Design a protein around this ligand. Sequence first.
Ligand code: CLA
Ligand SMILES: CC(/C=C/C=C(C)/C=C/[C@@]12O[C@]1(C)C[C@@H](O)CC2(C)C)=C\C=C\C=C(C)\C=C\C=C(C)\C=C\[C@@]12O[C@]1(C)C[C@@H](O)CC2(C)C
Ligand SMILES: CC(/C=C/C=C(C)/C=C/[C@@]12O[C@]1(C)C[C@@H](O)CC2(C)C)=C\C=C\C=C(C)\C=C\C=C(C)\C=C\[C@@]12O[C@]1(C)C[C@@H](O)CC2(C)C
Ligand code: SF4
Lengths: 119, 249, 42, 49, 203, 205, 82
Amino acid sequence: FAFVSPRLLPDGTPDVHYRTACGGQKLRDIMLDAYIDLYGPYDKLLLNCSGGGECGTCIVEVVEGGEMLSPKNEVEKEKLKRKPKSWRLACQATVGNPDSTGQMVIQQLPEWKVHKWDK
Amino acid sequence: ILLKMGAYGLIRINMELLPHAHYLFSPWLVIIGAIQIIYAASTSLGQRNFKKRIAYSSVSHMGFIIIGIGSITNIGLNGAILQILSHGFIGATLFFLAGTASDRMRLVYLEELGGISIPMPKIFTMFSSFSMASLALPGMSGFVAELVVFFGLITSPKFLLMPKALITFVMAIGMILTPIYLLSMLRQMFYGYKLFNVPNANFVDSGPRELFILICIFLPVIGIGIYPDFVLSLSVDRVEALLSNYYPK
Amino acid sequence: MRDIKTYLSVAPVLSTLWFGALAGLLIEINRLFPDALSFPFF
Amino acid sequence: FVKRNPKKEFLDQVKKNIYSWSYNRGYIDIFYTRVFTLGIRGLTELTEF
Amino acid sequence: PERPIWFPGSTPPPWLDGSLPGDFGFDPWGLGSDPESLRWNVQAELVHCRWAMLGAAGIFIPELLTKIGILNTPSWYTAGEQEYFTDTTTLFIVELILIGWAEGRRWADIIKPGCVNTDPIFPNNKLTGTDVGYPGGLWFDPLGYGTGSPEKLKELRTKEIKNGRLAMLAVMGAWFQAEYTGTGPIDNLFAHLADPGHATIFR
Amino acid sequence: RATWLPGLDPPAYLDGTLPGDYGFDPLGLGEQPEDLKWYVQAELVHCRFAMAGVAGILGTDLIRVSGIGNLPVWFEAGATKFDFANTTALFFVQLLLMGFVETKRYMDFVSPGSQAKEGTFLGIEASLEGLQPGYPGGPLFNPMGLAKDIENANEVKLKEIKNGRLAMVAMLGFIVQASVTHAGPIDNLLTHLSDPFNKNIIHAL
Amino acid sequence: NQRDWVVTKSIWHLSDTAIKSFYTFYAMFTVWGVCFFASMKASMADPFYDSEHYRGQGGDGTVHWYYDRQEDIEATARGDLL
Ligand code: CLA
Ligand SMILES: CC(/C=C/C=C(C)/C=C/[C@@]12O[C@]1(C)C[C@@H](O)CC2(C)C)=C\C=C\C=C(C)\C=C\C=C(C)\C=C\[C@@]12O[C@]1(C)C[C@@H](O)CC2(C)C
Ligand SMILES: CC(/C=C/C=C(C)/C=C/[C@@]12O[C@]1(C)C[C@@H](O)CC2(C)C)=C\C=C\C=C(C)\C=C\C=C(C)\C=C\[C@@]12O[C@]1(C)C[C@@H](O)CC2(C)C
Ligand code: SF4
């Protein structure tokens, strides 16, 4: 159980959600399991979606549990020139299947947040 | 001028004095000019200091003169003269513009040339205009010369349709090739926004003398390209190409 | 399957298979270049 | 058609194709890049040497 | 184990255990008794399944569509003799080269799995298949369709062999029919439809 | 390692220091050092003779057909004559100097450096060795001394190998090509370029 | 004239005429003898070729004067002598 905790879409104090996840998949599918929104204001049909690809519209910001993810690819190094070193793409990235005793906290899509004003 | 002496002499003492020494050697002249038109441009695109690029662009247009000296017709020889005039204009003006833009920036390699359009507009305008002229663009006199050269080659009597088409093809590749290396300079040296080149020092648009020189050389280009017959006052070709025109082969 | 291949590899069985191929080859050549008393190529 | 969506495991892959195409601008565009403007760039070097 | 057997109530051979797609315990002579030959033969049956599938498409579909009036394709039987834009020999030679390229690389993968799947020129064109005989990759899986869960591929591959077996019989059907009957395959169908109890092998 | 046969592994002895080590020696022809050491030069001397040799065959027939100059076919060159050249004496003459240069090279491989410590003056320095057996560059054999002997030797010899390996094949082409076509090599090219699908070795037979 | 072509698919007819400057090719060259008016646009002020931000007048002078470095090495030698 790679226990995950989402800091969702900045709201007043926090906007935390909780989710118990068995590691092994990517971040995209493991989020779309716990039904928490990742693709910002991006809809089903064709708008910046379909997983493991180009556009890069999922920019999850990792705060706690960073030393449990797969290492960064070079596509992440490419599509994230604007990044602070913190966040990654989460659409080409995986959590270890053997890390069933992890503890990871994630803030969802940035550029729609006003935070680090907290803690 | 000094380049065009090599063509005037070739017209005057070779085609007028040694016909059966020139009529059995015209096709190789045509072939050499045809391959030159593309070779000069293909090596121009490779250079990196725009002065040598302008030099090679001047080299390239000297293939139309060659192909017009061969392909023995009235217009092929006659279109060559219009070409030497419309190039003595354009190449001279382009070298003047290159030497005037430089000596203001002191950078010769085409990679560090920032956005010079912001400080000095008029140079940019009169440079793009003559680049268009050198592109054989219609209206300006860089077009009708090449057009008459094509017409002279096509209607030539000393050819039967086998090279009269392949040579025209390899000649027309020049129109695909020349803008690739002219606009590649126009884009690196003028477009783009360089540093905030606000200090009006070592950066001043062309004054009255240079601007008047540019305009006074430009106006003949338009005047000839609109109504070329201001340089077709040539009735010697009706006797110059009279000797050659029946003996063997 | 292994035992079949091994048996097919014993000496007499190869011999007929090898020589049979050799006989076929020579017969074909004599059918295409018959009488062949000299080697007139070079 | 979200509750009993049968082929979501397959359909999305079609998505993973179609978008990946349109963002790649109809790969024919990249073709002229990796052929023409990289062919002449070597041809000039060759005719220089 | 309890999978259907070709001969119900018989004891299937031990080396056939139902793992492979299309394993109905059929091997009376034990051609695949040893594991290695089985491995090679699995490929043999696999490719034969694909060639005939095109051949069945190659024979029956045109002869069908030319039997009705839509096209002009001649008999497959005399298809070889026809004279196309050049001599047959060179085309066969050209066929020898290009096929030898794939029948060369495929050969390398067979003798040594996984050592051939990267493009010799543009090395980012690597192929995705892992099972021998299932190359995968963007050339051979333009959308995937092979990368799935088991019990689905086993279904799908069995849907690939079971059709292929259907082809190889059919093309040898079109083979012998054209020899001892004088017409195309579709005529042999129709003349069998007018008087099913009379017009057969027994003329 | 990019051998010649992608699936096949390269043999254990073609480690790869020799330029052009594309793991290719199927018949077990180089599984002994002293064998392999003497085989490398053969490829080096063969290829160099086969580099110039094709050009002499090629260039001469190219200039003749176009019309710039005139020369007989390389096939027809053996019987050519201008003056003071008995093919008897030339054979002896060529056998002499070639005999001289070939041997002193042979003595170099047999005994490295035992070729530039002698009496005869003014030249006893260059013909020592290039420091690499098949590359005897010296300040006479490399009058534009333009080598560093180590670095480019991996990256430039690999050009001269793959250059030669191609050139040795090409010459083998003309011999067979002239053997069947009875004509010049470019003539073979010019004929085939005319109707490629009808001018082929299938038609030549 | 006004020839009337009845083409096989439409309804044409045309009218043409030949024209050419008779000899005014002399008068236009005489008018373009306005280069003798290239003297009013030369006595005008120069943009910066006379500006204080300019000294050295060759074609490489200001650009490649650039050997006060030698004079500076010499001044260094002199200062060392001091
Ligand atoms: C897909 C397979 C298939 C099909 C649908 C047919 C169908 C037909 N064949 Mg045929 N045939 C086949 C395979 C097939 N054959 C094979 C493999 C051979 C080589 C031995 C032949 C050799 C052959 C000859 C020589 C003749 C026919 C003829 C005929 C027609 C009349 C039936 C008859 O007398 O032949 C009976 C068929 C056989 C004795 C051989 C059949 C062999 C197959 C493999 C048996 C199993 C069939 C298969 C399980 C059916 C699948 C079920 C369903 C999909 C239909 C009929 C349209 C005759 C004709 O033209 O009629 C006027 C005729 O003269 N066939
Ligand atoms: C039937 C067949 C193989 C059958 C094998 C059998 C029964 C073996 C059975 C057994 O081994 C087992 C299973 C188990 C053992 O214990 C028992 C036995 C019983 C021993 C192969 C056919 C294989 C049939 C094939 C491959 C057909 C290919 C068609 C091709 C190539 C295309 C041809 C064309 O191009 C031409 C020629 C001309 C064009 O005009 C037209 C087209 C059609 C386009
Ligand atoms: C030297 C050479 C040619 C030199 C040509 C010369 C001098 C030409 C001279 C002339 O034209 C001129 C200049 C002018 C003319 O007027 C006179 C002549 C005389 C006509 C060709 C070599 C040609 C040599 C060749 C092609 C060698 C090929 C060898 C192969 C393929 C061997 C492969 C293998 O050995 C390996 C590599 C590994 C093993 O395990 C496997 C096998 C297969 C055994
Ligand atoms: S991968 Fe790139 S494209 Fe596919 S979903 Fe994540 S962001 Fe959208």
